[PDB]
Every structure is written in C-alpha cells, then in structure tokens.
Amino acid sequence: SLVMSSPALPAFLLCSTLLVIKMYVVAIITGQVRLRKKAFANPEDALRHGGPQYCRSDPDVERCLRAHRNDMETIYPFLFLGFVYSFLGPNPFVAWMHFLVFLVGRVAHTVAYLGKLRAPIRSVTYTLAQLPCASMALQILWEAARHL
Amino acid sequence: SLVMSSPALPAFLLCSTLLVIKMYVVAIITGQVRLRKKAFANPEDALRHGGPQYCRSDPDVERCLRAHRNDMETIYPFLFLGFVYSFLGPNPFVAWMHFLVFLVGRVAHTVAYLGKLRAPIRSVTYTLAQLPCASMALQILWEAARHL
Amino acid sequence: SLVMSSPALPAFLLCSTLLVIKMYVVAIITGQVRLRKKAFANPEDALRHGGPQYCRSDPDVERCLRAHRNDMETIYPFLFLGFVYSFLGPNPFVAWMHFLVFLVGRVAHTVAYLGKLRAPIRSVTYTLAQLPCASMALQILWEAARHL
Ligand SMILES: CC(C)C(=O)NCc1ccc(C(F)F)c(C(=O)Nc2nc(-c3ccc(Cl)cc3)c[nH]2)c1
Ligand SMILES: CC(C)C(=O)NCc1ccc(C(F)F)c(C(=O)Nc2nc(-c3ccc(Cl)cc3)c[nH]2)c1
Ligand SMILES: CC(C)C(=O)NCc1ccc(C(F)F)c(C(=O)Nc2nc(-c3ccc(Cl)cc3)c[nH]2)c1
Ligand SMILES: CCCCCCCCO[C@@H]1O[C@H](CO)[C@@H](O)[C@H](O)[C@H]1O
Ligand SMILES: CCCCCCCCO[C@@H]1O[C@H](CO)[C@@H](O)[C@H](O)[C@H]1O
Ligand SMILES: CCCCCCCCO[C@@H]1O[C@H](CO)[C@@H](O)[C@H](O)[C@H]1O
Ligand SMILES: CCCCCCCCO[C@@H]1O[C@H](CO)[C@@H](O)[C@H](O)[C@H]1O
Ligand SMILES: CCCCCCCCO[C@@H]1O[C@H](CO)[C@@H](O)[C@H](O)[C@H]1O
Ligand SMILES: CCCCCCCCO[C@@H]1O[C@H](CO)[C@@H](O)[C@H](O)[C@H]1O
Ligand SMILES: N[C@@H](CCC(=O)N[C@@H](CS)C(=O)NCC(=O)O)C(=O)O
Ligand SMILES: N[C@@H](CCC(=O)N[C@@H](CS)C(=O)NCC(=O)O)C(=O)O
Ligand SMILES: N[C@@H](CCC(=O)N[C@@H](CS)C(=O)NCC(=O)O)C(=O)O
C-alpha cells in the first residue's frame, strides 16, 4: 500500500481525515439548526418550510457558519502542509505530536465555538493548533529553498 | 507520465480539475452580477463604477457568494480525499463512480443554486455529492489506521 | 529528499508555503483589527473585552474577512493545481513563471485590498494571478484526459 510511502504518512492521513469528517459534522449541525430554528438563507428553502418570513438570519446559524469558516481557514492549509511535511523525513514521534496537537486543538476549537465557552478558550485553541502548522510551514520552506 | 501512478488517478484529476474550473466560472459569474447590478463590496470599487451608493448588498450577489462558499465547503475536501483515495488501489469502476457522482452532483448543485430551482432540489444534490466523499473518507480512515 | 521528485516541485513548494504563511498573516491582522477597533463576532469575546456593545461589525474587519475569503477562493485551488502540474514535466522556467506570477499577483492583491488602493488595482491583480491557474488547469485536463 502507498500509505507506506513515509513513516509519518499514516498518522497524517488519520488526523486529516478525522478533521474532514469533523467539518462534515459541522455542516450537518448547521443544517439541523436551520431546520429547527426555521432560519433559511434562500427564499425557495423558506417557502418549502413554512413561508417567506423564515428566510432570515439566526445567531446560532451564523455561529455555525463562523465555526465552519474558521475550519476552512485552518484545516485546509493543514491538509496541504501536513501532507508535504510527511514526506520530509521528520522524526516519527515529532510528526505525530504535530498532527495530534492540531487534531486536539481543532476539535477543542469547534467544541468551544459551538458550545459558546467563555473567552479566551476558543482563541487559545486556535493559537495552539496554529503552532504545529507554523512549524511545518517553516520546515517546508527550508527544504524547498535548499533544493532550488 | 506520473498520471499513471495509479489506475484511478486520471479519472480523479479530470473530475477535480473540471470542478476547480467550475468554481472559477462561479467567480466570473459573481463579478458579472456585481457589475451589471452595480452592487460592490468596496467603496473604491463603487466610486469607479458610478458612486458611493453602489457599495451595497444585492440578493443575487449574496446567492453567488453562497454557491461559491458551499463549493469551498465540499469541493476542497474532495480534492484531498479523492487524491488520497486514488492511491489506495480501489476498483477502477467503483472509483470512477465515486468521482462521477461527485462531479454530476456538484454541477447540479450550482445549477440548482444559481438557477433558483425549487426546494429540495439543491439540498438533494448536496447530499448525493456528499455520499462518495463520506465513502472515501471512511476507506482512507481504515487504510490509515491499519498502517499505524 | 522527496522534494526532488520533479524539477519544478521545489519552486512550487516555496511559493505555496509562502502564500499559506501570507494567509496566516491576514488572519493575524484580522485579529489585531478586531482587538484594536473592539469589533467582535461573538458575545463571549465582547464581554471579555469591554461589554456587549462590542459585539458588532466593523468595515475594516469586514474588509480583512473579504481578503481572507478571496485568498481561500484562489490560493487553495493553486495548492492543488500547482502540485499536480509540478509532476507533469513542464519546462522548469515556464513552471517557475507560472508560480511566480501567482505569488506576486496574490501578494499584490492582499496589499491592494487591505491598503484600500484605488480601483481597478485589486481587480487587475486578481485577474493576473488567475492566468497561471487557468493555464495549469487546462494542462492538467489534457494530461488527465489522454490517460483515460
Ligand atoms: C446538511 C443538510 C442536508 C441540511 O440539513 N440542510 C438543511 C436544509 C435546508 C433547506 C432544505 C430545503 F429547503 F431544501 C432542506 C431539505 O428539506 N432537504 C432535503 N433533503 C432531502 C433528501 C436528500 C437526499 C435524499 Cl436521497 C432524499 C431526500 C429532502 N429534503 C434542508
Ligand atoms: C471576476 C472579476 C474579474 C470581476 O468581474 N469582478 C467584478 C469587478 C468588481 C470591481 C471592479 C473595479 F471596481 F475594480 C472591477 C473592474 O473594473 N475590473 C477590471 N479589471 C480590469 C483588467 C484586468 C486585467 C487586465 Cl490584463 C486588464 C484590465 C479592468 N477593470 C470588476
Ligand atoms: C489571530 C487571533 C489570535 C486574534 O488576534 N484574535 C483576536 C481575538 C478575539 C477574541 C479574543 C477573546 F475574546 F477570546 C482574543 C483573545 O483575548 N485571545 C487570547 N489568546 C490568548 C492566549 C493564546 C495562547 C496562549 Cl499559549 C496564551 C494566551 C489570550 N487571549 C483575541
Ligand atoms: C464536532 C462537533 C462538536 C459539537 C460541539 C457542540 C457542543 C454543544 O454544547 C452545548 O452548547 C450549548 C450552547 O450552544 C449549551 O447550551 C450546552 O450546555 C452545551 O452542551
Ligand atoms: C509566537 C511565535 C510563534 C513561532 C512559531 C513556532 C514554529 C517553530 O517551528 C520550528 O522552527 C524551527 C526554526 O525554523 C525549526 O528548526 C523546527 O523544526 C520547527 O519545529
Ligand atoms: C457552472 C455555472 C452554472 C451556471 C448556472 C446558472 C443557471 C441560470 O439559470 C437561470 O436562472 C435564473 C434565476 O437565477 C432564471 O430566471 C432563468 O430562467 C434560468 O435560466
Ligand atoms: C445516511 C448514512 C450515510 C452513510 C455514508 C455512506 C458511506 C459508505 O461507504 C462505504 O463504507 C463501507 C464501510 O466503511 C466501506 O467498506 C465501503 O468501501 C464504503 O464505500
Ligand atoms: C501580507 C499582508 C500585507 C498587509 C498589507 C497592508 C497594507 C496597509 O497599508 C496601509 O493601508 C491603510 C488603509 O487600510 C492606509 O491608510 C495606509 O496609508 C497604508 O500604509
Ligand atoms: C481571457 C482568456 C484567458 C485564457 C486563459 C489562458 C490559459 C492559457 O494556457 C495555455 O493553454 C494552452 C492550450 O490549452 C496550453 O497548450 C498551454 O500549455 C497553456 O499555457
Ligand atoms: N477570520 C478570523 C481570523 C482570526 C482567527 O482565526 N481568530 C480565531 C481565534 S480568536 C477565531 O476563532 N476566530 C473566530 C472566527 O473566525 O469566527 C476572525 O475573524 O476572527
Ligand atoms: N453551510 C451550509 C451547511 C449545510 C449545507 O451545506 N447545506 C446544503 C444543502 S441544504 C446547501 O446547499 N447549503 C446552502 C449554502 O451553503 O448556502 C449551510 O449553511 O446550509
Ligand atoms: N467572490 C468574489 C468573486 C470575484 C472575484 O474574486 N473578484 C476579485 C476581483 S474584482 C476580487 O478581488 N473580489 C473581492 C472579494 O472577493 O471580496 C467577489 O465577490 O468579488
């Protein structure tokens, strides 16, 4: 199997795929909030589900959208950085720690966001998860630059 | 050519690249709607195109932005999942069906969204396209986990 | 090192990683604008930083969010397209020019957006950066199609 291409790759693929699934969960939650609170973004949706007055914004829907957007701002770069980083021959344990800190930090971020936890819990989880990303980005820069 | 690395890869690259181009088309449409309806997001844009009153929201522009955002929420994960999945030695026909269902579902989604088709047509296309993504995600999880 | 897999790859990884870092910079700027202008998206954030009246929108924050969103609409597809393109054996110089035009165009875009430069400077930088992306997308299409 081509998952064996590098020692850190299986760990990366596990964490990344779990995070993609976590984003899918956020999308499902968003839909449920829209349906249960009757807050739709489109008139065609609202008309099917009770009338035009239900094409409206809702604070909980907006919160779900913010969590999903923050995921797109952070998890998508990780998908790129972590994949490339897996092929740079990092220490296996060190690589696992990068991926695990990101995974735990991002899951905690979504819990803090959707659960409306007190500040600065969410902000802290964002920063903690960004640390391994910054680390990987720098390592990739050095490897790329030295092969120019 | 390195497109021959795995039997499913060419099909994946065809569908993915078509979907990226489809997102570029949505961006172009959005710009055209802004210009034709004179609804700009920035005062500097509005001042060049008729005056400050044209820095304003428009329902059609907002709809275009929602379609593009939904694309980012779904197509970007597919770019990751489908690429990895291509290297897990899936049955070629089964892989093609995953990619084709996603491609058709997503093109239909954009048509349903921008064309303002009645509910739940758009919602159905979203769910149909998510099915192969969920399938690939699970398969990657198993492959990654078993190589830990 | 696996950065040597193709002659264009190191250049791609350098430009892509710089652009990811540039997006991280936009996120940091956004946070600074929120804190300094006291414009938070969440009541929990506002309550920690002065009171509920600071859960409010701000034009500079919204501008930062637009720049970041435009980055997600353009840089993320480049991460995919440029990676695949690196493995299609393009002329090394031609590949470098694709990556450099994208890098310069996107950095200029962020400067034009956040710096509130007169129209159509930002629009021009967007279009200039999209050119190499369109070029790579077409080249990938041909390579993928011919291997079907
Ligand atoms: C995460 C998504 C799925 C979500 O929750 N979104 C909330 C939402 C918003 C608006 C609408 C409606 F206005 F269009 C609907 C709706 O009525 N959807 C709907 N889908 C089916 C469906 C899908 C697949 C299949 Cl095989 C069969 C039936 C029926 N109804 C749902
Ligand atoms: C998908 C994009 C392209 C789109 O439609 N956006 C709508 C839009 C919004 C705001 C503005 C304006 F306010 F800044 C403009 C505008 O006047 N753009 C503009 N670009 C050129 C251009 C570009 C490349 C080249 Cl080589 C030559 C000339 C001229 N004008 C356009
Ligand atoms: C780009 C990000 C970082 C940014 O600027 N966002 C603006 C912002 C918005 C809201 C809040 C607050 F309401 F939650 C805060 C805030 O007080 N954050 C905060 N982080 C720490 C922190 C982080 C890591 C560590 Cl190891 C230690 C302490 C403290 N305070 C910041
Ligand atoms: C991967 C998806 C994680 C979902 C985390 C959702 C956490 C929900 O947490 C809930 O939040 C509510 C406020 O929103 C509170 O009223 C509840 O006390 C709390 O249980
Ligand atoms: C608040 C400041 C944040 C700093 C970001 C932490 C990133 C550290 O990243 C580290 O950088 C070193 C030098 O490039 C590398 O040698 C290490 O491999 C890398 O882990
Ligand atoms: C990849 C991009 C696909 C573009 C699909 C746009 C479909 C446009 O479809 C149009 O929508 C209008 C409402 O918006 C209707 O008034 C028109 O009858 C319909 O033709
Ligand atoms: C409404 C419920 C949605 C279920 C998502 C469909 C995903 C099915 O995906 C399937 O999962 C199996 C078990 O992991 C795998 O063996 C198959 O290879 C895979 O195609
Ligand atoms: C990668 C991040 C690039 C940051 C570019 C920010 C450019 C800031 O530029 C500033 O913009 C202000 C208006 O916003 C003007 O008042 C100032 O004259 C100008 O210096
Ligand atoms: C305004 C029109 C924009 C056109 C997009 C420019 C993309 C050009 O891209 C070019 O396309 C050729 C034909 O497919 C290829 O042979 C070249 O390798 C490629 O660089
Ligand atoms: N787009 C972000 C940029 C900065 C950021 O990512 N901040 C973190 C830590 S405070 C966050 O959780 N932001 C909330 C959000 O993006 O909605 C924002 O507007 O806040
Ligand atoms: N961000 C989405 C999450 C759920 C989702 O993706 N729903 C599908 C099917 S109803 C959709 O097309 N959403 C419309 C949109 O994202 O604007 C939303 O707000 O609706
Ligand atoms: N989502 C974009 C689609 C078109 C686009 O990307 N336009 C470029 C050139 S005018 C841009 O810089 N848009 C500003 C933005 O996305 O906020 C929009 O609403 O404008």
mmCIF file of all heavy atoms in Angstrom, chain C residues 78-110:
data_model
loop_
_atom_site.group_PDB
_atom_site.id
_atom_site.type_symbol
_atom_site.label_atom_id
_atom_site.label_comp_id
_atom_site.label_asym_id
_atom_site.label_seq_id
_atom_site.Cartn_x
_atom_site.Cartn_y
_atom_site.Cartn_z
ATOM 1 N N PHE C 78 -4.898 26.806 -6.257
ATOM 2 C CA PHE C 78 -3.480 26.808 -6.661
ATOM 3 C C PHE C 78 -2.671 25.707 -5.970
ATOM 4 O O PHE C 78 -1.825 25.064 -6.601
ATOM 5 C CB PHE C 78 -2.843 28.173 -6.392
ATOM 6 C CG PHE C 78 -1.359 28.219 -6.663
ATOM 7 C CD1 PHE C 78 -0.881 28.466 -7.950
ATOM 8 C CD2 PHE C 78 -0.441 28.028 -5.633
ATOM 9 C CE1 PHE C 78 0.486 28.518 -8.203
ATOM 10 C CE2 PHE C 78 0.925 28.074 -5.880
ATOM 11 C CZ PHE C 78 1.389 28.319 -7.166
ATOM 12 N N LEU C 79 -2.919 25.497 -4.676
ATOM 13 C CA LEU C 79 -2.236 24.433 -3.924
ATOM 14 C C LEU C 79 -2.443 23.076 -4.590
ATOM 15 O O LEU C 79 -1.519 22.266 -4.668
ATOM 16 C CB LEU C 79 -2.713 24.383 -2.469
ATOM 17 C CG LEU C 79 -2.462 25.614 -1.585
ATOM 18 C CD1 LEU C 79 -2.981 25.383 -0.173
ATOM 19 C CD2 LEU C 79 -0.985 25.975 -1.548
ATOM 20 N N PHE C 80 -3.659 22.846 -5.079
ATOM 21 C CA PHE C 80 -3.977 21.620 -5.793
ATOM 22 C C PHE C 80 -3.369 21.605 -7.197
ATOM 23 O O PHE C 80 -2.625 20.684 -7.547
ATOM 24 C CB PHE C 80 -5.498 21.423 -5.876
ATOM 25 C CG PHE C 80 -5.896 20.212 -6.670
ATOM 26 C CD1 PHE C 80 -5.757 18.937 -6.127
ATOM 27 C CD2 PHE C 80 -6.392 20.345 -7.964
ATOM 28 C CE1 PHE C 80 -6.110 17.814 -6.859
ATOM 29 C CE2 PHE C 80 -6.747 19.223 -8.702
ATOM 30 C CZ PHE C 80 -6.602 17.959 -8.146
ATOM 31 N N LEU C 81 -3.687 22.628 -7.989
ATOM 32 C CA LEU C 81 -3.284 22.682 -9.396
ATOM 33 C C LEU C 81 -1.768 22.692 -9.560
ATOM 34 O O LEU C 81 -1.220 21.948 -10.378
ATOM 35 C CB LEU C 81 -3.882 23.911 -10.084
ATOM 36 C CG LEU C 81 -5.406 23.995 -10.219
ATOM 37 C CD1 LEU C 81 -5.797 25.377 -10.715
ATOM 38 C CD2 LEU C 81 -5.955 22.909 -11.139
ATOM 39 N N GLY C 82 -1.098 23.538 -8.780
ATOM 40 C CA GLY C 82 0.357 23.663 -8.846
ATOM 41 C C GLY C 82 1.090 22.396 -8.446
ATOM 42 O O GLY C 82 2.129 22.065 -9.028
ATOM 43 N N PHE C 83 0.553 21.684 -7.456
ATOM 44 C CA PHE C 83 1.142 20.413 -7.027
ATOM 45 C C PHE C 83 1.080 19.374 -8.147
ATOM 46 O O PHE C 83 2.098 18.765 -8.492
ATOM 47 C CB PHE C 83 0.477 19.882 -5.754
ATOM 48 C CG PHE C 83 1.107 18.621 -5.227
ATOM 49 C CD1 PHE C 83 2.321 18.666 -4.544
ATOM 50 C CD2 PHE C 83 0.496 17.386 -5.425
ATOM 51 C CE1 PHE C 83 2.904 17.507 -4.058
ATOM 52 C CE2 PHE C 83 1.076 16.221 -4.943
ATOM 53 C CZ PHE C 83 2.283 16.282 -4.259
ATOM 54 N N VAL C 84 -0.108 19.193 -8.723
ATOM 55 C CA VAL C 84 -0.301 18.246 -9.823
ATOM 56 C C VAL C 84 0.552 18.649 -11.033
ATOM 57 O O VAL C 84 1.249 17.815 -11.617
ATOM 58 C CB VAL C 84 -1.796 18.118 -10.207
ATOM 59 C CG1 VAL C 84 -1.975 17.208 -11.419
ATOM 60 C CG2 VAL C 84 -2.602 17.584 -9.028
ATOM 61 N N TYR C 85 0.509 19.933 -11.378
ATOM 62 C CA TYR C 85 1.254 20.494 -12.512
ATOM 63 C C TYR C 85 2.760 20.250 -12.398
ATOM 64 O O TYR C 85 3.424 19.983 -13.404
ATOM 65 C CB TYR C 85 0.934 21.987 -12.630
ATOM 66 C CG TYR C 85 1.762 22.788 -13.610
ATOM 67 C CD1 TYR C 85 1.526 22.719 -14.986
ATOM 68 C CD2 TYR C 85 2.758 23.648 -13.154
ATOM 69 C CE1 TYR C 85 2.280 23.476 -15.878
ATOM 70 C CE2 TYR C 85 3.508 24.407 -14.032
ATOM 71 C CZ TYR C 85 3.268 24.318 -15.390
ATOM 72 O OH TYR C 85 4.029 25.081 -16.248
ATOM 73 N N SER C 86 3.287 20.321 -11.175
ATOM 74 C CA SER C 86 4.709 20.062 -10.923
ATOM 75 C C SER C 86 5.143 18.674 -11.397
ATOM 76 O O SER C 86 6.309 18.470 -11.738
ATOM 77 C CB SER C 86 5.033 20.226 -9.437
ATOM 78 O OG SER C 86 4.857 21.570 -9.026
ATOM 79 N N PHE C 87 4.204 17.733 -11.433
ATOM 80 C CA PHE C 87 4.507 16.348 -11.811
ATOM 81 C C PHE C 87 4.220 16.009 -13.276
ATOM 82 O O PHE C 87 4.344 14.850 -13.680
ATOM 83 C CB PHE C 87 3.778 15.371 -10.884
ATOM 84 C CG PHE C 87 4.339 15.329 -9.491
ATOM 85 C CD1 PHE C 87 3.753 16.062 -8.469
ATOM 86 C CD2 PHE C 87 5.459 14.556 -9.199
ATOM 87 C CE1 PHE C 87 4.269 16.029 -7.182
ATOM 88 C CE2 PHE C 87 5.979 14.518 -7.917
ATOM 89 C CZ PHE C 87 5.384 15.256 -6.906
ATOM 90 N N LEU C 88 3.853 17.014 -14.068
ATOM 91 C CA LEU C 88 3.534 16.800 -15.484
ATOM 92 C C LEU C 88 4.714 17.095 -16.412
ATOM 93 O O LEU C 88 4.545 17.206 -17.630
ATOM 94 C CB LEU C 88 2.314 17.632 -15.903
ATOM 95 C CG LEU C 88 1.007 17.530 -15.112
ATOM 96 C CD1 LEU C 88 -0.056 18.390 -15.778
ATOM 97 C CD2 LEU C 88 0.526 16.095 -14.968
ATOM 98 N N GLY C 89 5.904 17.218 -15.827
ATOM 99 C CA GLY C 89 7.123 17.521 -16.575
ATOM 100 C C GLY C 89 7.077 18.799 -17.398
ATOM 101 O O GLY C 89 7.449 18.784 -18.576
ATOM 102 N N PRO C 90 6.624 19.918 -16.795
ATOM 103 C CA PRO C 90 6.641 21.157 -17.570
ATOM 104 C C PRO C 90 8.064 21.698 -17.682
ATOM 105 O O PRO C 90 8.933 21.307 -16.898
ATOM 106 C CB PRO C 90 5.775 22.104 -16.730
ATOM 107 C CG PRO C 90 5.956 21.625 -15.328
ATOM 108 C CD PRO C 90 6.154 20.136 -15.410
ATOM 109 N N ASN C 91 8.305 22.570 -18.657
ATOM 110 C CA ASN C 91 9.577 23.279 -18.732
ATOM 111 C C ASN C 91 9.816 24.011 -17.411
ATOM 112 O O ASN C 91 8.939 24.747 -16.949
ATOM 113 C CB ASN C 91 9.589 24.262 -19.903
ATOM 114 C CG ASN C 91 10.887 25.043 -19.995
ATOM 115 O OD1 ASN C 91 10.982 26.167 -19.506
ATOM 116 N ND2 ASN C 91 11.900 24.440 -20.608
ATOM 117 N N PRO C 92 10.991 23.790 -16.788
ATOM 118 C CA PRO C 92 11.312 24.355 -15.474
ATOM 119 C C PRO C 92 11.121 25.869 -15.397
ATOM 120 O O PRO C 92 10.493 26.354 -14.453
ATOM 121 C CB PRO C 92 12.786 23.985 -15.287
ATOM 122 C CG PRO C 92 12.951 22.740 -16.085
ATOM 123 C CD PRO C 92 12.085 22.939 -17.295
ATOM 124 N N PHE C 93 11.640 26.597 -16.383
ATOM 125 C CA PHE C 93 11.491 28.053 -16.437
ATOM 126 C C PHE C 93 10.027 28.469 -16.567
ATOM 127 O O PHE C 93 9.580 29.396 -15.886
ATOM 128 C CB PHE C 93 12.319 28.655 -17.582
ATOM 129 C CG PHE C 93 12.096 30.132 -17.782
ATOM 130 C CD1 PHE C 93 12.672 31.060 -16.918
ATOM 131 C CD2 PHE C 93 11.305 30.596 -18.830
ATOM 132 C CE1 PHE C 93 12.464 32.421 -17.096
ATOM 133 C CE2 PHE C 93 11.094 31.955 -19.013
ATOM 134 C CZ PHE C 93 11.674 32.868 -18.145
ATOM 135 N N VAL C 94 9.293 27.779 -17.439
ATOM 136 C CA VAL C 94 7.872 28.060 -17.663
ATOM 137 C C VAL C 94 7.079 27.818 -16.377
ATOM 138 O O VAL C 94 6.226 28.630 -16.010
ATOM 139 C CB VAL C 94 7.297 27.241 -18.844
ATOM 140 C CG1 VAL C 94 5.789 27.428 -18.963
ATOM 141 C CG2 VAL C 94 7.973 27.640 -20.151
ATOM 142 N N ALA C 95 7.382 26.717 -15.689
ATOM 143 C CA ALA C 95 6.755 26.415 -14.396
ATOM 144 C C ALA C 95 7.043 27.498 -13.353
ATOM 145 O O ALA C 95 6.118 27.956 -12.674
ATOM 146 C CB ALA C 95 7.169 25.044 -13.888
ATOM 147 N N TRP C 96 8.307 27.908 -13.237
ATOM 148 C CA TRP C 96 8.695 28.970 -12.303
ATOM 149 C C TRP C 96 7.920 30.259 -12.569
ATOM 150 O O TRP C 96 7.502 30.946 -11.635
ATOM 151 C CB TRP C 96 10.202 29.250 -12.362
ATOM 152 C CG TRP C 96 11.056 28.064 -12.045
ATOM 153 C CD1 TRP C 96 10.705 26.977 -11.302
ATOM 154 C CD2 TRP C 96 12.417 27.854 -12.446
ATOM 155 N NE1 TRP C 96 11.758 26.096 -11.222
ATOM 156 C CE2 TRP C 96 12.821 26.612 -11.917
ATOM 157 C CE3 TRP C 96 13.329 28.593 -13.205
ATOM 158 C CZ2 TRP C 96 14.097 26.093 -12.122
ATOM 159 C CZ3 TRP C 96 14.598 28.074 -13.406
ATOM 160 C CH2 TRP C 96 14.968 26.838 -12.868
ATOM 161 N N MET C 97 7.730 30.579 -13.847
ATOM 162 C CA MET C 97 6.986 31.775 -14.234
ATOM 163 C C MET C 97 5.512 31.689 -13.840
ATOM 164 O O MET C 97 4.929 32.687 -13.424
ATOM 165 C CB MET C 97 7.126 32.054 -15.735
ATOM 166 C CG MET C 97 8.495 32.577 -16.151
ATOM 167 S SD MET C 97 8.952 34.124 -15.340
ATOM 168 C CE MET C 97 7.499 35.121 -15.662
ATOM 169 N N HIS C 98 4.917 30.503 -13.974
ATOM 170 C CA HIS C 98 3.536 30.273 -13.505
ATOM 171 C C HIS C 98 3.437 30.538 -12.001
ATOM 172 O O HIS C 98 2.559 31.280 -11.550
ATOM 173 C CB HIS C 98 3.076 28.836 -13.790
ATOM 174 C CG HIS C 98 2.569 28.613 -15.182
ATOM 175 N ND1 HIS C 98 3.409 28.485 -16.269
ATOM 176 C CD2 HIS C 98 1.311 28.458 -15.659
ATOM 177 C CE1 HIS C 98 2.688 28.278 -17.357
ATOM 178 N NE2 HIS C 98 1.412 28.254 -17.015
ATOM 179 N N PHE C 99 4.357 29.947 -11.238
ATOM 180 C CA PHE C 99 4.329 30.065 -9.776
ATOM 181 C C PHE C 99 4.628 31.484 -9.305
ATOM 182 O O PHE C 99 4.001 31.967 -8.359
ATOM 183 C CB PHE C 99 5.306 29.085 -9.105
ATOM 184 C CG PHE C 99 5.142 27.646 -9.531
ATOM 185 C CD1 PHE C 99 6.250 26.800 -9.566
ATOM 186 C CD2 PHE C 99 3.891 27.118 -9.856
ATOM 187 C CE1 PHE C 99 6.119 25.473 -9.943
ATOM 188 C CE2 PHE C 99 3.756 25.788 -10.239
ATOM 189 C CZ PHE C 99 4.873 24.965 -10.281
ATOM 190 N N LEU C 100 5.582 32.143 -9.970
ATOM 191 C CA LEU C 100 5.993 33.500 -9.605
ATOM 192 C C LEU C 100 4.902 34.530 -9.897
ATOM 193 O O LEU C 100 4.664 35.436 -9.091
ATOM 194 C CB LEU C 100 7.299 33.879 -10.315
ATOM 195 C CG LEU C 100 7.966 35.194 -9.897
ATOM 196 C CD1 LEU C 100 8.312 35.186 -8.415
ATOM 197 C CD2 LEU C 100 9.203 35.456 -10.744
ATOM 198 N N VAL C 101 4.244 34.393 -11.050
ATOM 199 C CA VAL C 101 3.143 35.290 -11.410
ATOM 200 C C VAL C 101 2.022 35.138 -10.385
ATOM 201 O O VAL C 101 1.457 36.133 -9.932
ATOM 202 C CB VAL C 101 2.628 35.060 -12.853
ATOM 203 C CG1 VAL C 101 1.301 35.771 -13.088
ATOM 204 C CG2 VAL C 101 3.660 35.537 -13.869
ATOM 205 N N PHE C 102 1.728 33.901 -9.989
ATOM 206 C CA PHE C 102 0.715 33.697 -8.957
ATOM 207 C C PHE C 102 1.127 34.309 -7.623
ATOM 208 O O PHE C 102 0.337 35.010 -6.994
ATOM 209 C CB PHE C 102 0.357 32.218 -8.768
ATOM 210 C CG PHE C 102 -0.870 32.018 -7.927
ATOM 211 C CD1 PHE C 102 -2.128 32.331 -8.433
ATOM 212 C CD2 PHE C 102 -0.771 31.564 -6.619
ATOM 213 C CE1 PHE C 102 -3.265 32.174 -7.656
ATOM 214 C CE2 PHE C 102 -1.906 31.399 -5.840
ATOM 215 C CZ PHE C 102 -3.155 31.696 -6.359
ATOM 216 N N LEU C 103 2.363 34.049 -7.196
ATOM 217 C CA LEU C 103 2.857 34.569 -5.922
ATOM 218 C C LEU C 103 2.815 36.097 -5.874
ATOM 219 O O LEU C 103 2.279 36.679 -4.929
ATOM 220 C CB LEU C 103 4.282 34.068 -5.651
ATOM 221 C CG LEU C 103 5.018 34.646 -4.434
ATOM 222 C CD1 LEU C 103 4.382 34.197 -3.129
ATOM 223 C CD2 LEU C 103 6.485 34.243 -4.479
ATOM 224 N N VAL C 104 3.383 36.742 -6.894
ATOM 225 C CA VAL C 104 3.436 38.208 -6.942
ATOM 226 C C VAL C 104 2.024 38.797 -7.038
ATOM 227 O O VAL C 104 1.685 39.738 -6.313
ATOM 228 C CB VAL C 104 4.332 38.711 -8.098
ATOM 229 C CG1 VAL C 104 4.224 40.224 -8.256
ATOM 230 C CG2 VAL C 104 5.782 38.306 -7.860
ATOM 231 N N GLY C 105 1.201 38.220 -7.911
ATOM 232 C CA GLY C 105 -0.187 38.652 -8.072
ATOM 233 C C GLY C 105 -0.982 38.582 -6.777
ATOM 234 O O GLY C 105 -1.706 39.516 -6.438
ATOM 235 N N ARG C 106 -0.837 37.483 -6.042
ATOM 236 C CA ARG C 106 -1.590 37.318 -4.794
ATOM 237 C C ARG C 106 -1.093 38.206 -3.651
ATOM 238 O O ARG C 106 -1.894 38.731 -2.876
ATOM 239 C CB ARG C 106 -1.640 35.846 -4.368
ATOM 240 C CG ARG C 106 -2.494 34.963 -5.278
ATOM 241 C CD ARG C 106 -3.884 35.537 -5.570
ATOM 242 N NE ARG C 106 -4.658 35.842 -4.363
ATOM 243 C CZ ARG C 106 -5.919 36.274 -4.368
ATOM 244 N NH1 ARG C 106 -6.567 36.449 -5.516
ATOM 245 N NH2 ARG C 106 -6.541 36.526 -3.221
ATOM 246 N N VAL C 107 0.225 38.373 -3.535
ATOM 247 C CA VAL C 107 0.756 39.293 -2.532
ATOM 248 C C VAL C 107 0.258 40.712 -2.842
ATOM 249 O O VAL C 107 -0.226 41.416 -1.947
ATOM 250 C CB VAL C 107 2.301 39.227 -2.430
ATOM 251 C CG1 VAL C 107 2.834 40.331 -1.525
ATOM 252 C CG2 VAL C 107 2.743 37.866 -1.905
ATOM 253 N N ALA C 108 0.342 41.106 -4.113
ATOM 254 C CA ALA C 108 -0.163 42.408 -4.567
ATOM 255 C C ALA C 108 -1.660 42.578 -4.294
ATOM 256 O O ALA C 108 -2.105 43.655 -3.890
ATOM 257 C CB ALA C 108 0.143 42.616 -6.044
ATOM 258 N N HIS C 109 -2.428 41.510 -4.504
ATOM 259 C CA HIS C 109 -3.866 41.513 -4.206
ATOM 260 C C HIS C 109 -4.148 41.873 -2.747
ATOM 261 O O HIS C 109 -4.983 42.730 -2.468
ATOM 262 C CB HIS C 109 -4.502 40.154 -4.545
ATOM 263 C CG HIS C 109 -5.999 40.146 -4.439
ATOM 264 N ND1 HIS C 109 -6.665 39.906 -3.254
ATOM 265 C CD2 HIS C 109 -6.956 40.346 -5.373
ATOM 266 C CE1 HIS C 109 -7.968 39.956 -3.466
ATOM 267 N NE2 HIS C 109 -8.171 40.229 -4.744
ATOM 268 N N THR C 110 -3.458 41.212 -1.820
ATOM 269 C CA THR C 110 -3.646 41.479 -0.396
ATOM 270 C C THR C 110 -3.233 42.910 -0.025
ATOM 271 O O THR C 110 -3.928 43.583 0.743
ATOM 272 C CB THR C 110 -2.911 40.430 0.466
ATOM 273 O OG1 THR C 110 -3.403 39.127 0.129
ATOM 274 C CG2 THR C 110 -3.154 40.682 1.948
#
